[PDB]
Symmetry: D2
Amino acid sequence: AAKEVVVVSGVRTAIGDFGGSLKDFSPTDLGAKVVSEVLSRANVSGDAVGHVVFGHVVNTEPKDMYLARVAAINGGVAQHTPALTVNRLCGSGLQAIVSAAQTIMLGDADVAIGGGSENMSRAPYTVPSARFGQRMGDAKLVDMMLGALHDPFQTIHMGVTAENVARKYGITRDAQDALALESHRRAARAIAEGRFKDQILPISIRTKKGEVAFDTDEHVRHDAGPDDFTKLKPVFVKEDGTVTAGNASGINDAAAAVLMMSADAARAQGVKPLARLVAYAHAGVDPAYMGIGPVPATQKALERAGLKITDLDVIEANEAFAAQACAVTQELGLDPAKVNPNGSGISLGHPIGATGALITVKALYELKRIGGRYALVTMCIGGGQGIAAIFENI
Amino acid sequence: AKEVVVVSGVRTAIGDFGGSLKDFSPTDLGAKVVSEVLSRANVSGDAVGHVVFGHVVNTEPKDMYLARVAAINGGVAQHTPALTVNRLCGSGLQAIVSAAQTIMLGDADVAIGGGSENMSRAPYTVPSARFGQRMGDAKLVDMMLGALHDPFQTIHMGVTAENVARKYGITRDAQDALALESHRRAARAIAEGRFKDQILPISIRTKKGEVAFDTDEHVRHDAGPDDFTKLKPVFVKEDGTVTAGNASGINDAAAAVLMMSADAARAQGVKPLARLVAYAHAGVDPAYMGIGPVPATQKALERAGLKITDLDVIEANEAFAAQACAVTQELGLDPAKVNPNGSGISLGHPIGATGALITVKALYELKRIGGRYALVTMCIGGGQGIAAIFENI
Amino acid sequence: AKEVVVVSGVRTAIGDFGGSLKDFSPTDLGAKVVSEVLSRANVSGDAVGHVVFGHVVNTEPKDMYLARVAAINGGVAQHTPALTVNRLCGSGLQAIVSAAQTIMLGDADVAIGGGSENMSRAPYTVPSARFGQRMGDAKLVDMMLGALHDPFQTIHMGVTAENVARKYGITRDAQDALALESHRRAARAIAEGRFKDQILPISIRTKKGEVAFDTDEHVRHDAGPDDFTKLKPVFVKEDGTVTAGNASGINDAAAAVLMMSADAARAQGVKPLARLVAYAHAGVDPAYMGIGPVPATQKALERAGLKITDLDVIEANEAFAAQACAVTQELGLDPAKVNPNGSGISLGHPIGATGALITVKALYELKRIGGRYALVTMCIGGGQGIAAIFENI
Amino acid sequence: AAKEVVVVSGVRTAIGDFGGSLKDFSPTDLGAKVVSEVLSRANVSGDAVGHVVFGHVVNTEPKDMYLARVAAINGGVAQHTPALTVNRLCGSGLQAIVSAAQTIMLGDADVAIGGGSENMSRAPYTVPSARFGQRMGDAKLVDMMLGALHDPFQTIHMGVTAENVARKYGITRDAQDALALESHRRAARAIAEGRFKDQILPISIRTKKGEVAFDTDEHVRHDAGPDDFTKLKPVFVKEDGTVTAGNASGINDAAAAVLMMSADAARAQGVKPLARLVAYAHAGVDPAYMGIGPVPATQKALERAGLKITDLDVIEANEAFAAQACAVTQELGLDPAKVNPNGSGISLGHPIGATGALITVKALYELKRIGGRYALVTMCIGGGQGIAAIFENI
């Protein structure tokens, strides 16, 4: 049978705004930082890692095509360890964990690191005409960030797909604004109570005034009220819009990782782990309704775990758009009080490829905060997919 | 872990840098090979549990969706998950392994694994363009050349080939000898038609009319040893051995295989190419990445319960003659069974697709000669190797 | 106002877009023509009072220094002031006028006037690159095409040529007739050697060895009317008449003349080409810029006390057959005396240099036929014309 | 003989910082604004202009290759008026005035506008490899602003040539800092007393808070003291430097213009003019010592006017670098109290192609402020030139 997967350690950076506090840190720099820190939290030597897998979507420089391997080596993992970079768009961070968990389940590794890293502030422009020349007439610099945020089949912003989902599932503007506000208030409470302190790795940021520690998610508005979201205008369609800058996730910079071991290695070393992996599942949907991807993915994951919605103490379902996040909670019958209890993409940000690893970290630490048992991690995926994993606190 | 059978496979002909496939984006070539493998396996696009594609150099925004776009435009139903993987030069074989893992773990009964790369379309980036340069000249960065540079010492992959030539005693004469033979085996394979059945022709729009591109165009059909000894090194100024002639090209191509669980293949009455026996991965010193195949192959043979002499076909990519000679030498392989129809030096190296493409070759060679076991392995920039073993059936 | 004599002049052969002079920067070509005119006039580079050069499209930072770089690297002493002027297609003749003005006003006894342009090397700009684009695709702007667009209506200069064809009754047949004849006159001039003495050969580095570039390469030597009537318009989709064949090319070239006060020329025993009789400028509707030469020429003939029938040589640049036919028609000129050896359609239009270059032609034609008065005029994008009249001596 | 040239009107914009308040106004936009305003100040119809000449160095867009003609037409000058753009680097603004004055002197025009316009914030990057392609390996985006500030013969920054001049002419660091400080204090006094109000055309600048008037030279430090310049480090050479960011001119955005007429047209219309043109002169020098160009140019201009240094009531000599400006004043024997009495490039900025027209405006208004008679306008020129003009208040 398949080997049990234990998540022994996890960490994330705080999440930086677009053009904000992490804009000078490359995706391989952020990835190496979380690799070194998960190894130290698990008390695992860099020479004892079987596989490294990292999620990552937008290459900012040539090194990023080597991302998992540079993150591993500069993170202190020995050169004999294989390293893989995976891209399942917004779900890459969680995919990387599943992919790393699969090496353990199949007996190819006893230890594996799964992470993600993304720096959207550093997303590049391309010039397709530069290699062979344009010859005459104007050409373009192609924004690879906005490009990654366009559905490749209809060439519409992810935001338009969020409007498709609000329309189809009856998610009003007032519902989306209520979810957005509540996410900022939960995140601001979590910061004030220190709920994130143990799971965040501070980053010292070179400033002209001397070094200061970046250890707080800066996208969060701490003074928010209803009118900050009411006054805003829809941004992605000209007619009958509901999706705004305020009730859509940010675009952001972050990295996160977890370190996992077979259950037998974990036993024999005597680790005090975060959780075990119970099940995962994938799904594809209509690309024009990609925001509801978590629904079938979550259903299939719960079937594989032998669990029901009501057994979930903690749910991290990324708020890519309040339009889709509301529809996900509505179609699955979730309790909004248990979904994203400390905020999510709208308030903390959406550092694409890192997001799915980061919110796994969030779910596992929240399980420990409340003494819960089971957590669901799930996210929608551009191009029309969903991914879900269930973890058990142990 | 369930048994994985490879029922069908296909590849495009390999295009030269700036050549016949320069106008075909990577998702276009990926969609073509997807649609064709579905039809060769006679499998509904509604019956696929997972698509995984390897791809290294994003040429446009759509490429960040490559597997998904390849699957949808190739006729796979929207309900199928789709994943893009990057293990540099091994990405193509990785995608096959990753897709086979979904079947081994019972997450899918049917899976497609493939690779697609168009280096001709590799872009230049401008890292200062979003927030501005402000003052001073800025860089336009070659993402193709950057993909071919080791990220630790910022040296060309070719310098790591010189390192491997030093450490393992691969002379310049030894390299050009392999390079020449690779081209003769390829030209010989093209002439006997060995590649016909595995290649999907692509119609390439010319002013002269419609013309079908179905032949690997990197091959020198008139090659003699003199064409190689006259060239001189290009990666180290003095005391060098790797040249443009004994190193692979960089190229444009796509390939894919369709796989099923053993049960599903039986129930569908499909006559399969091969079965997956084992795979393994290895990490090595990045300065010596070209030797990656040796420990990968050793670990895979261990898991498969085989030895080197049980291998009837070996596709060990020729990234550089300097590396491939050393791989053969260290593993004790029979050069007659290693790349019997050429490899990267003669046929090309369309990186993210190569591992899938040479898997296709290896399976079709097994059928040509009636062999049993085939090894597929390659070196990986950054310092890895990947290897897989297949059994004809 | 003192008398201005043109003692010497020279030009390069005109290169095609992407052709023989594509590797010669504008300051390089400018320095060449400076050094040569000094030596043809036998004037020390220490004796020059002013250098003025016309130039429109900056190809690199040095071009913002063009006149100064051309003068210094051409051997003019550093104590000579140097000015770059831009009156678009008239810049070359403007530089001559501006340099002649320093002599007329007694600010200098010796002055060089010239033009230099390399359109092949015209750059692309990135206006968002300094402070960044932030979000959304950005533009790479073609500065060559932008130079050829009217800045008021953002239409190609060719559309203004269609406007001129409408208003003045210039048929498509009339245009191709001028275009064909321009090419035959040029090929005929090249064959008799009319251009030999005025052209400075430039050695152009080829893999085949050293080869001398001394012949205007835009000329079709085998031209018949059929090569023009088969092409069809390119600047308005329907109801058009201007084509690639009856419009000038865009080209790379440099030219210059050296001038002196009458007294200084006498004292130096130099045998001059001609004297400056008069000049004038005109502004017109930008949508009809191609008719600019007509009022300029009329005003210049007034100041010179001459009429159209006193002109033995006319160099009226052929920007578009549609415009040049109308200029000849409105002024009542004899087509036999207008561009007797071709002009922009056959020879090319290296814009900032053209006005200087066709001044050179006009003066050398006066010597060839023993004529007295020559008119030099051209149209100017944005809606101007410039004209100058010279007297052989 | 040559016809007398009367300067009837003049105007300038305030001078914007690099990336500052004028960064969104193109050079043809600024040029049209000053064209329309000089015409209105002279009470001259746009249909009665004989020639327009504008100085301009760095093309920011295709329209700039038509700069004088777009400035003229969009400024309200009739389309029958010829328009010329001139480039004599830093001296282009004054050259444009001389060139326009020459059309009057030679009887080709009775009215002529001479101006300059530059927007360095909008100076572009080029990509020489874009038209025909780079094929392989990295390429460059070429900074055309920094390129314009490099000597084309040795490829050294103008700042290094300023160090050549300080060395050769014995201009110490303390002298350069004293000149720099004094320029900011004079400029700040001029702003507080309103000395610039009549000569500046306000520009309404679209801001999110509503329209605000840009009418004050923003480069000026109003709170400066000696230590702001002492603390700074040399910027252009590694050894034995004296030239700093603080004692070098800024790079800037501005436009200016004057309108001139033959003396007979001015008489017959009855204008109340600023000044008459007395003489101008040019000079070239060693490109490596370009900063002393104003010395021989000023000497030759004074010879042509039949005047002496001591007849000059007002001197506008552009402070490109305190190193060169000090040497110019020292070699000509000028009184520093009469040179740049209200500041210059170091404190107000150096909007290259506009600078020479702008400081003509400054000199003519200062003549009126003090009832002086003769003003010298002079500037150094990259590549090694100088230009000078003398005006008489009438």
